[PDB]
């Protein structure tokens, strides 16, 4: 299962700094969502 | 959507409503039990 949830520490709007925030939060990657422009973290779970 | 395990739901996910409740408290919009491990999974637009 891949878990995907918004970064808790990423500041502001998401348009690399997301990936960095997510790894800091112990996820394995991060990306920006297309519509809401949020930093979303992903990891195996 | 975002989809991840509920952090506050206690124990095994037997039926959906208590999982949905926990997920909504965690500011998701819905929850459901996983087929086999029967974990409570939360979902929301993201």
UniProtKB/Swiss-Prot annotation, chain B:
Gene Ontology BP annotations: defense response to fungus; killing of cells of another organism
Keyword Secreted among record annotations: yes
Coiled-coil ranges per UniProt: none
Gene Ontology CC: extracellular region; vacuole
Localization annotation: Secreted; Vacuole
Key words, A-Z: Antimicrobial, Disulfide bond, Fungicide, Plant defense, Secreted, Signal, Vacuole
Expression sites (tissue/organ): Most abundant in the epidermal cell layers of the petals and sepals, within the connective cells of the anthers, and the cortical cells of the style. Not detected in the tapetum, pollen mother cells, the transmitting tissue, the vascular bundles of the anther and style or in leaves. Expressed also in ovaries, but barley detectable in roots.
Disulfide bonding pattern of the chain: 2-46, 13-33, 19-40, 23-42
Protein family according to the UniProt entry: Belongs to the DEFL family.
Described purpose of this protein according to its UniProt entry: Plant defense peptide with antifungal activity against F.oxysporum and B.cinerea. Retards the growth of the Lepidopteran insect pests H.armigera and H.punctigera.
Name under which the protein is recorded: Flower-specific defensin
Organism of origin: Nicotiana alata
Full-sequence portion shown in this chain: 27 to 72 of 105
């Amino acid at each position: 299962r891949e878990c995907k949830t918004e970064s808790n520490t990423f500041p502001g709007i998401c348009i690399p700094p997301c990936r960095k925030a997510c790894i800091s939060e112990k996820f394995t990657d991060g990306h920006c969502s297309k519509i809401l422009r949020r930093c979303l973290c992903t990891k195996p779970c």
